[model samples]
Target: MRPSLSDYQHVASGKVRELYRVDDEHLLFVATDRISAFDFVLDTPIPDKGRILTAMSVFFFGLLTVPNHLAGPPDDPRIPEEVLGRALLVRRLDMLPVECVARGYLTGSGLLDYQRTGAVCGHVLPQGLGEASRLDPPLFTPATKADIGEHDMNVDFAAVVGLVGAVRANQLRDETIKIYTRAAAHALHKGIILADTKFEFGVDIEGNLVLADEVFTPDSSRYWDAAHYQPGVVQDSFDKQFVRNWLTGPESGWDRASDTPPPPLPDEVAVATRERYIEAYERISGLSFSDWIGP
Candidate 1:
């Protein structure tokens, strides 16, 4: 029988996902359609938001050729009906404490860190790299999982070695780049750019490294449409950017830096944003959203 919400103990939560204990060895990583930006979660929840991410993660888990924590298909019985389409039944792993990050392009926090220090996660690059400049042979920039509402910080390779030992650190770095390259290549063919993305790794019962958490989804990774791609400026994002733009845009009049909570997403903004997500899934995986049968 499928487990109810009360059947499992709620454990941990990230920005848009939650973790539930199924037993000593399994977890239900549930994704919600609720969106957040500028460190605040908006009041409105997008319809089917969780399912879209769940589909993307399932796609990457199969395409990346890496072992992950997924225990069954997207429609697995352990997933509750209310969250049926967006939930995953995955192996409850001893999650490696480090936030595994790999970056191929200079943008967002990486650019900020580079601007301030001329290096990212201890990898020194040639001067004059601007926003969206592609980095040569991407670097493994690890971070401690920050507390909720805060951001993850970049750290050097040596720090990772100190935390998880040299061998595991090397494995994580190599695996992150490999998977990103493969997924990026795949996205390229589908007319999207898998800009820099973060992956979480966990050790299984046998101490083998298995990829956990969401992979290559908009919430976890930035997606840019290749048709509109331009390097000099921030490209239009394939998913949440529309909602974010609407929230902090002029009409909203909400100060992103202030303590006040963000305004609810407008109806038009929400619909268009939902379509953008569906478009990304269909374009990348060539799978129609209507075909998904949730538990």
Candidate 2:
């Protein structure tokens, strides 16, 4: 059962989500079935993606004992029935400007940073580290949250200290590492490598810092198959890697370096991507996707 979309007043919209004003104290977060690859919001939608991610976020929120912005259960009255599984009722808080990232394995921009300077966000790493290399005792590499469709700039801890003060900055780093350590271990037990993840936090009216946005979902994290993981080469991920591979592959005819938008995902490609997301959810949570509420 779902409610009418027009019933709720729109507050804001992000790359794949929309916010609706539920009341003064709460907001509704609607995760759309949209998908993004290489920062471009693709035209093709992944069926049930919104529900899968929302479920994944709720799953992690339950596991983490830390205070968060989730104000109600999955079936909160504030959530429209049409968007029941994909929409969340969250407390409205003053969100921090920083994108808190924790890296347990080197890849992506971290790998590039290490290749060029042997450091990521001022945390120097050992030499000879290659793509997908495991980082000993993960690093808290914070970044400035960029505008929509923009790249986040990685900054040193000192820079974060300047933005939020030393005490709060350290608190962010500590909480981020703490959660990442626990979640990474959990994912490992579930046979998934929690390579890296980004977290966002906000200050509550009670002066407490709470984990605010989405947690360790595929979109917000890099999940590699533990059994297939190899240090030197790129690892197979359970996220949107398939979509990325296809887009960068010869079939799409899209250049990554060019300004043009990417072409629509092929039918097989979209289906595989959707299946990967569902598989990741089921494998990690040990729950049947069939049990999840759908539109």
Candidate 3:
């Protein structure tokens, strides 16, 4: 019902997005309404989530200074009406094996690593940084791209150098931090905190680095409401954290440690999550979501 709208041959499938080979030079990237929590893709889908994420990422691609792989607009003729706003036609390239990540706040795995070993990725952070504590100079913490349903393992600069050589590794790190700094400022101005985001890079035929896949959308970044932002504890996120909490709650009758999958979310939970995705897009982009291209 999503990327299956066209005759294009499906090439890749991620947790929430799909890639279809449109031609030799281009690929169709489609975001689905599907949502995943704690490594499980839920039975219920979030309404219009695909369109919202696609809109936000395309908006950032246009706004950011870096070269990107966007080959056509959201409403391009090549995109079928069945998946107009949710699909992007992109230039094909050899995507890097590493996840180029930048973090401006200590949270998630960064916090976990820092608390355990006094560093994240490879940089030894300053003493006494807690969850949501701001990092002055946002660090470029690269991670090995994990397969679907698996956690991305953090690695040091040495590991990236091994993956792409010293020159490309430095290029990735510098560009990641620069973009994150700019993006964080923009989100802060909009009254949101851009905690951290991952940028996927690809090498073109001419050996050029191009930003590929999704950019600073909720699916790729940690966005927190500025009004309620606090450093001591984990701040409320604008993504699926709420959905995560509910699945582990006492009423869910689920165990994260168990081999069985988590249960489907309640109707209200799905609705609230869809609303949060909408708010994240609207608040960050300052554009009426209704004006975005339709599915």
Per-residue alpha-carbon lDDT of model 2 for 1-295, expressed as tens digits?
4567787789888889899887789888889999988778999999899999998998899889999999988887667778979989899999888989999999999999889998999998888899998998999999996666678999999999999889999999999999999999999999998999999899998889999878999889998999898899988767788898999999999999997899999988888888999988998888888888765
Question: Which candidate wins on lDDT?
Answer: 2
Cα-based lDDT for every prediction: 0.85, 0.89, 0.89
Is candidate 1 or 2 superior in lDDT?
Answer: 2
Q: Runs in model 2 with CA error above 4 Å?
A: 1-3
TM-score, structure 1 vs. true: 0.96
Largest TM-score belongs to which candidate? 1
User: Any residue pairs clashing in model 3, and if so which?
Assistant: none
- Candidate 1 C-alpha error for residue 159, in Å: 0.6
In the order shown, the candidates' Cα RMSDs to the true structure are: 1.4, 1.5, 2.1
Write the residue-wise lDDT of candidate 3 on 1-295 in tens digits.
2334557988889888999998899999999999877778888898889999998998888779999999987888888788888999999999999999999999999999999999999999899889899998998989986666578999999999999999999999999999899888988998888999998999999999999999998888988999999889879767787788888888789999895888888888888998888888888889989899895
Q: Against the hidden reference, what TM-scores do the models get?
A: 0.96, 0.95, 0.94
- TM-score-based ranking, best first? 1, 2, 3
Q: What is the per-residue lDDT of model 1 for residues 22-126, given as tens digits with 9 covering 90 to 100?
A: 888888899998887777878888887888888888888889778889988877777777778888888888888788887878898888889999988998889
TM-score (C-alpha) between model 3 and the true structure: 0.94
Candidate 2 lDDT (Cα, 0 to 1): 0.89
Model 2 error, position 293 (Å): 1.7
